[PDB]
Design an enzyme around this catalytic site. Structure first.
Site, PDB file in Angstrom:
ATOM      1  N   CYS B  46       0.963  -1.299  -0.020  1.00  0.00           N
ATOM      2  CA  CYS B  46       0.058  -0.070   0.082  1.00  0.00           C
ATOM      3  C   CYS B  46       1.081   1.312   0.141  1.00  0.00           C
ATOM      4  O   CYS B  46       2.016   1.139   0.596  1.00  0.00           O
ATOM      5  CB  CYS B  46      -0.974  -0.029   1.198  1.00  0.00           C
ATOM      6  SG  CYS B  46      -1.887   1.507   1.490  1.00  0.00           S
ATOM      7  N   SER B  48       0.436   3.836   1.871  1.00  0.00           N
ATOM      8  CA  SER B  48       1.105   4.031   3.009  1.00  0.00           C
ATOM      9  C   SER B  48       2.169   3.721   3.840  1.00  0.00           C
ATOM     10  O   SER B  48       2.754   3.922   4.525  1.00  0.00           O
ATOM     11  CB  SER B  48      -0.381   3.950   3.932  1.00  0.00           C
ATOM     12  OG  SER B  48      -1.399   4.461   3.780  1.00  0.00           O
ATOM     13  N   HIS B  51       4.866   5.822   2.552  1.00  0.00           N
ATOM     14  CA  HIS B  51       4.917   6.765   3.214  1.00  0.00           C
ATOM     15  C   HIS B  51       5.729   6.777   4.288  1.00  0.00           C
ATOM     16  O   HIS B  51       6.377   7.709   4.781  1.00  0.00           O
ATOM     17  CB  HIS B  51       3.547   7.319   3.649  1.00  0.00           C
ATOM     18  CG  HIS B  51       2.597   7.729   2.461  1.00  0.00           C
ATOM     19  ND1 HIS B  51       3.235   8.186   1.310  1.00  0.00           N
ATOM     20  CD2 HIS B  51       1.342   8.021   2.635  1.00  0.00           C
ATOM     21  CE1 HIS B  51       2.088   8.582   0.790  1.00  0.00           C
ATOM     22  NE2 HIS B  51       0.816   8.368   1.297  1.00  0.00           N
ATOM     23  N   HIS B  67       0.725  -3.585   6.622  1.00  0.00           N
ATOM     24  CA  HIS B  67      -0.624  -3.542   7.371  1.00  0.00           C
ATOM     25  C   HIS B  67      -1.868  -4.021   6.544  1.00  0.00           C
ATOM     26  O   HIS B  67      -2.774  -4.078   7.060  1.00  0.00           O
ATOM     27  CB  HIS B  67      -1.057  -1.895   7.619  1.00  0.00           C
ATOM     28  CG  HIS B  67      -1.136  -1.138   6.465  1.00  0.00           C
ATOM     29  ND1 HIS B  67       0.116  -0.417   5.678  1.00  0.00           N
ATOM     30  CD2 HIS B  67      -2.094  -0.701   6.015  1.00  0.00           C
ATOM     31  CE1 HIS B  67      -0.641   0.211   4.686  1.00  0.00           C
ATOM     32  NE2 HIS B  67      -1.985   0.173   4.733  1.00  0.00           N
ATOM     33  N   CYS B 174      -6.827  -3.479   3.811  1.00  0.00           N
ATOM     34  CA  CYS B 174      -6.690  -1.884   3.488  1.00  0.00           C
ATOM     35  C   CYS B 174      -7.358  -1.532   2.197  1.00  0.00           C
ATOM     36  O   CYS B 174      -8.230  -0.785   2.244  1.00  0.00           O
ATOM     37  CB  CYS B 174      -5.204  -1.608   3.433  1.00  0.00           C
ATOM     38  SG  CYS B 174      -5.240   0.319   3.496  1.00  0.00           S
TER      39      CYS B 174
HETATM   40  N1  LIG Z   1      -7.481   6.654   4.645  1.00  0.00           N
HETATM   41  C1  LIG Z   1      -7.021   5.430   4.628  1.00  0.00           C
HETATM   42  O1  LIG Z   1      -7.626   4.579   5.513  1.00  0.00           O
HETATM   43  C2  LIG Z   1      -6.242   4.910   3.550  1.00  0.00           C
HETATM   44  C3  LIG Z   1      -6.101   3.749   3.215  1.00  0.00           C
HETATM   45  C4  LIG Z   1      -5.232   3.245   2.056  1.00  0.00           C
HETATM   46  C5  LIG Z   1      -4.713   4.048   1.432  1.00  0.00           C
HETATM   47  N2  LIG Z   1      -4.547   5.382   1.830  1.00  0.00           N
HETATM   48  C6  LIG Z   1      -3.858   6.465   1.201  1.00  0.00           C
HETATM   49  O2  LIG Z   1      -4.244   6.764  -0.116  1.00  0.00           O
HETATM   50  C7  LIG Z   1      -3.472   7.425  -0.937  1.00  0.00           C
HETATM   51  C8  LIG Z   1      -3.619   6.246  -2.234  1.00  0.00           C
HETATM   52  O3  LIG Z   1      -3.062   5.035  -1.779  1.00  0.00           O
HETATM   53  P1  LIG Z   1      -2.727   4.195  -2.981  1.00  0.00           P
HETATM   54  O4  LIG Z   1      -4.054   3.860  -4.080  1.00  0.00           O
HETATM   55  O5  LIG Z   1      -2.243   2.810  -2.386  1.00  0.00           O
HETATM   56  O6  LIG Z   1      -1.517   4.976  -3.767  1.00  0.00           O
HETATM   57  P2  LIG Z   1      -1.038   4.796  -5.236  1.00  0.00           P
HETATM   58  O7  LIG Z   1      -1.086   3.467  -5.791  1.00  0.00           O
HETATM   59  O8  LIG Z   1       0.303   5.641  -5.169  1.00  0.00           O
HETATM   60  O9  LIG Z   1      -1.981   5.877  -6.088  1.00  0.00           O
HETATM   61  C9  LIG Z   1      -2.003   7.095  -6.042  1.00  0.00           C
HETATM   62  C10 LIG Z   1      -2.252   7.843  -7.543  1.00  0.00           C
HETATM   63  O10 LIG Z   1      -2.148   9.346  -7.535  1.00  0.00           O
HETATM   64  C11 LIG Z   1      -1.844   9.626  -8.807  1.00  0.00           C
HETATM   65  N3  LIG Z   1      -1.601  10.900  -8.413  1.00  0.00           N
HETATM   66  C12 LIG Z   1      -0.195  11.543  -7.904  1.00  0.00           C
HETATM   67  N4  LIG Z   1      -0.183  12.867  -8.016  1.00  0.00           N
HETATM   68  C13 LIG Z   1      -1.315  13.151  -8.408  1.00  0.00           C
HETATM   69  C14 LIG Z   1      -1.764  14.491  -8.873  1.00  0.00           C
HETATM   70  N5  LIG Z   1      -1.257  15.613  -8.509  1.00  0.00           N
HETATM   71  N6  LIG Z   1      -3.041  14.366  -9.302  1.00  0.00           N
HETATM   72  C15 LIG Z   1      -3.810  13.411  -9.732  1.00  0.00           C
HETATM   73  N7  LIG Z   1      -3.380  12.121  -9.684  1.00  0.00           N
HETATM   74  C16 LIG Z   1      -1.927  12.331  -9.135  1.00  0.00           C
HETATM   75  C17 LIG Z   1      -0.679   8.611  -8.988  1.00  0.00           C
HETATM   76  O11 LIG Z   1      -0.335   8.755 -10.282  1.00  0.00           O
HETATM   77  C18 LIG Z   1      -1.327   7.439  -8.679  1.00  0.00           C
HETATM   78  O12 LIG Z   1      -1.932   6.702  -9.750  1.00  0.00           O
HETATM   79  C19 LIG Z   1      -2.213   7.208  -0.441  1.00  0.00           C
HETATM   80  O13 LIG Z   1      -1.693   8.608   0.261  1.00  0.00           O
HETATM   81  C20 LIG Z   1      -2.366   6.409   0.749  1.00  0.00           C
HETATM   82  O14 LIG Z   1      -1.417   6.700   2.070  1.00  0.00           O
HETATM   83  C21 LIG Z   1      -5.335   5.950   2.934  1.00  0.00           C
HETATM   84  O1  LIG Z   2      -3.093   2.839   4.142  1.00  0.00           O
HETATM   85  C1  LIG Z   2      -3.735   2.909   5.369  1.00  0.00           C
HETATM   86  C2  LIG Z   2      -3.159   4.081   6.369  1.00  0.00           C
HETATM   87  C3  LIG Z   2      -3.768   5.247   6.867  1.00  0.00           C
HETATM   88  F1  LIG Z   2      -5.079   5.761   6.141  1.00  0.00           F
HETATM   89  C4  LIG Z   2      -3.058   6.043   7.498  1.00  0.00           C
HETATM   90  F2  LIG Z   2      -3.728   7.233   7.855  1.00  0.00           F
HETATM   91  C5  LIG Z   2      -2.045   5.878   8.345  1.00  0.00           C
HETATM   92  F3  LIG Z   2      -1.297   6.602   9.000  1.00  0.00           F
HETATM   93  C6  LIG Z   2      -1.137   4.756   7.695  1.00  0.00           C
HETATM   94  F4  LIG Z   2      -0.259   4.441   8.469  1.00  0.00           F
HETATM   95  C7  LIG Z   2      -2.039   3.696   7.042  1.00  0.00           C
HETATM   96  F5  LIG Z   2      -1.405   2.605   6.952  1.00  0.00           F
HETATM   97 ZN   LIG Z   3      -3.237   1.120   3.264  1.00  0.00          ZN
END
Ligand SMILES: NC(=O)c1ccc[n+]([C@@H]2O[C@H](COP(=O)([O-])OP(=O)([O-])OC[C@H]3O[C@@H](n4cnc5c(N)[nH+]cnc54)[C@H](O)[C@@H]3O)[C@@H](O)[C@H]2O)c1
Ligand SMILES: OCc1c(F)c(F)c(F)c(F)c1F
Ligand SMILES: [Zn+2]
Ligand SMILES: NC(=O)c1ccc[n+]([C@@H]2O[C@H](COP(=O)([O-])OP(=O)([O-])OC[C@H]3O[C@@H](n4cnc5c(N)[nH+]cnc54)[C@H](O)[C@@H]3O)[C@@H](O)[C@H]2O)c1
Ligand SMILES: OCc1c(F)c(F)c(F)c(F)c1F
Ligand SMILES: [Zn+2]
Ligand SMILES: [Zn+2]
Ligand SMILES: [Zn+2]
Lengths: 374, 374
Positions: B46, B48, B51, B67, B174
């Site tokens: 993921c 995250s 990150h 995770h 996730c």
């Molecule tokens: N809230 C939650 O519980 C939760 C859970 C899982 C992931 N996340 C977050 O969600 C985000 C996405 O996760 P993911 O899908 O695994 O990531 P990912 O696979 O890297 O996807 C992100 C996408 O964003 C695109 N992107 C980057 N910059 C831009 C921009 N300026 N405009 C438009 N598109 C852009 C990029 O090309 C990619 O396809 C990350 O920040 C994670 O940390 C949060």
């Molecule tokens: O991808 C899920 C995810 C989150 F949404 C967070 F906000 C975070 F801090 C983290 F560690 C995480 F794994």
């Molecule tokens: Zn996640």
């Protein structure tokens, strides 16, 4: 008859920011098609009218302000179907055209015909009905209620009960409906919940009324003016806190008092900092915060979006989320059936000619609502 | 037998930020009371997790990250009642203690026992079960799935269908659940609506799945990487747009495309600017925008609160708003009943030993989800 003729009357003209209103003669054109000319009976002094004076709210000057009012229809333009001469009416500062995508939506009320987002200070047709000293004067929110007579578009007026006391129900034109709706309609305050209300003016008091009506167990009023607390308790506050009394930031105090954050908070002041504080003090996973206060023009707040990621909901509203033309007559009917009270909001009454004194009372902190009578 | 004994096994240890994972032997203590030791079968990569590597997320190092995973219970500590040795399980990075005010609330899911807000990198008891080269190694979100064996608190594990394919259902830990729930549970996307989804990675694709499941008429994918568009359309996007192709800001483009703003927008990237853009592109009176992306640590966004005052709703969520322990087994059951698909999210399947290569695939833009198999 005055129908079809220019009316000369007194209005409160604001020529310049940060100056008293000038009570002087204006010329009020007759209503064009789908317009309504109203003889004003009573108008409230809302803080948003003062924002026009202070420059917090930018709208074209010179202007006839006023948006919280009630009056009696003097005449109607061609094609008007929803009011008649002699009807009691409330001008609607948020229109309800009934035709736009927002009007058609079950939850939207911010009709696309509004003059709030990008104010022009005109009628719907882009022109003015007001002349003063031979100069055109702007409208305000399509209502301009600080005048013995105004002209409004039909979509910006609602017919109300013929037996309504106009000196009370003018508050349904802004402050009561806004606060009450922000609680009952927008936030959807739940029975047994804990609420925090920032700002205990007429609108914040109306929020408290709505929170109590919705069955909140705790309603914490927040104001830097402790003189506001007695009335807040009268209308349903269970406790009041003054941020100036505390060493810690009030969001921390409120989080502690509510054993981890409140269910619902309301910003009813108009400050960027209190908008963020109000968000923060709601519970991080399931709290809801509603912005009601009007921010200073063109200024941005700063916040950490982790406040939302954890689960908070942040929203704002105009006019309590009420579809204006549908809702205003119903609110009046409910008032007449004693479903809510307006007298707690009315602290002063003055003749219209004493409008500047009415603004002085608001600015000093002494009043809630002053009602001006024409 | 391994039960009651220290296990020496392979794990991917992150010793410091912005360096590769070190794949090496760790010691995994047996589970204490109310703890569960799990033999991992599959774990997803993921963003995250990345990150943590990049410093976008701050958590104590050295750490065993990971995770999003599934495995098989090796042993249970005293007092565990919800899983048994041999059970298939998904670790829950958002726990469900069932006792706190959030767990008891009908809507909330961000259990107060979480290790996200103020990460300690430990078990619930404030200690670690991991050692490597004689040094204690931190946990991550109470899960630490980048290891052949992990130990989790009982409140951080769910039992799932014994017939589950763990190399697919690990995504329910996730990315699938988060995106799907953000649409169906948090936003509550409506039939016939228009949605905009910013970011078309594994999570954004799952948002699209949820928007389609909810009956959205239009689902506009937004990404700067046009290579992501084909798969977004496969799972339900009706159109895709790349902000780089336009002279105007994309919020303006999306407002125009949707004849005045979208019903629902989702930020699924992790940028402050796209959070504000996503809010802005939803209809000003009744739009809803949900933040899903995780932005850089300790940075504030700037926004004009008039965006909210007109009537917009802004919210965020962790794990799609799902109460984790209740929801994970039901989601797996739904998957087994063919209610949604997971294969569209899986672009690569690698041995665990290739974890670094998996992260390189993500960072290069080439993958959606890589599943690592132990
Ligand atoms: N809230 C939650 O519980 C939760 C859970 C899982 C992931 N996340 C977050 O969600 C985000 C996405 O996760 P993911 O899908 O695994 O990531 P990912 O696979 O890297 O996807 C992100 C996408 O964003 C695109 N992107 C980057 N910059 C831009 C921009 N300026 N405009 C438009 N598109 C852009 C990029 O090309 C990619 O396809 C990350 O920040 C994670 O940390 C949060
Ligand atoms: O991808 C899920 C995810 C989150 F949404 C967070 F906000 C975070 F801090 C983290 F560690 C995480 F794994
Ligand atoms: Zn996640
Ligand atoms: N959204 C809407 O449709 C709508 C309708 C009506 C009013 N408004 C706005 O709502 C706000 C309140 O209006 P009102 O009730 O007429 O105004 P008001 O009577 O001036 O009340 C504001 C209250 O805020 C208090 N206050 C000032 N600063 C602070 C502070 N730092 N902390 C706590 N309390 C403080 C102040 O003492 C006063 O009692 C104004 O910004 C209006 O412009 C918005
Ligand atoms: O008090 C109601 C009110 C508002 F809520 C505004 F947002 C605004 F711009 C305005 F002029 C106004 F009068
Ligand atoms: Zn309309
Ligand atoms: Zn007002
Ligand atoms: Zn809990």
């Amino acid at each position: 008859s005055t129908a079809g003729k220019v009316i000369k009357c007194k209005a409160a003209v604001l020529w310049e920011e940060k100056k008293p209103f000038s009570i002087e003669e204006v010329e009020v054109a007759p209503p064009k098609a789908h317009e309504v000319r109203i003889k004003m009976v009573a108008t409230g002094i809302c803080r948003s009218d003062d924002h026009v004076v202070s420059g917090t709210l930018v709208t074209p000057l010179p202007v006839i302000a006023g948006h919280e009012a009630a009056g009696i229809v003097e005449s109607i333009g061609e094609g008007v179907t929803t009011v008649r001469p002699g009807d009691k009416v409330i001008p609607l500062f948020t229109p309800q055209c009934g035709k736009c995508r927002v009007c058609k939506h079950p939850e939207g009320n911010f009709c696309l015909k509004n003059d709030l987002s990008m104010p022009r200070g005109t009628m719907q047709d882009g022109t003015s009905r007001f002349t003063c000293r031979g100069k055109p004067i702007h409208h305000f929110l399509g209502t301009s209620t600080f005048s013995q007579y105004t002209v409004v578009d039909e979509i910006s007026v609602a017919k109300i009960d013929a037996a309504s006391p106009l000196e009370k129900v003018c508050l349904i034109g802004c402050g009561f409906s806004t606060g009450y709706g922000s609680a009952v309609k927008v936030a959807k305050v739940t029975q047994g919940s804990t609420c925090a209300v920032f700002g205990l003016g007429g609108v914040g008091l109306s929020v408290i009324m709505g929170c109590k009506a919705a069955g909140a167990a705790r309603i914490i009023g927040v104001d830097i003016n402790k003189d506001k607390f007695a009335k807040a308790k009268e209308v349903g506050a269970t406790e009041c806190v003054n941020p100036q009394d505390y060493k810690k930031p009030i969001q921390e105090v409120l989080t502690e008092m509510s054993n981890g954050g409140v269910d619902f908070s309301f910003e009813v002041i108009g400050r960027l900092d209190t908008m963020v504080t109000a968000l923060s003090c709601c519970q991080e996973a399931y709290g809801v915060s509603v912005i009601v206060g009007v921010p200073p023009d063109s200024q941005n707040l700063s916040m950490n979006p982790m406040l939302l990621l954890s689960g908070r909901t942040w929203k704002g509203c105009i006019f309590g989320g009420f579809k204006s033309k549908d809702s205003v007559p119903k609110l009046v009917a409910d008032f007449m059936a004693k479903k809510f009270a307006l007298d707690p909001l009315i602290t002063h009454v003055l003749p219209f000619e004493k409008i500047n004194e009415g603004f002085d009372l608001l600015r000093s902190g002494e009043s809630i609502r002053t009602i001006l009578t024409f």
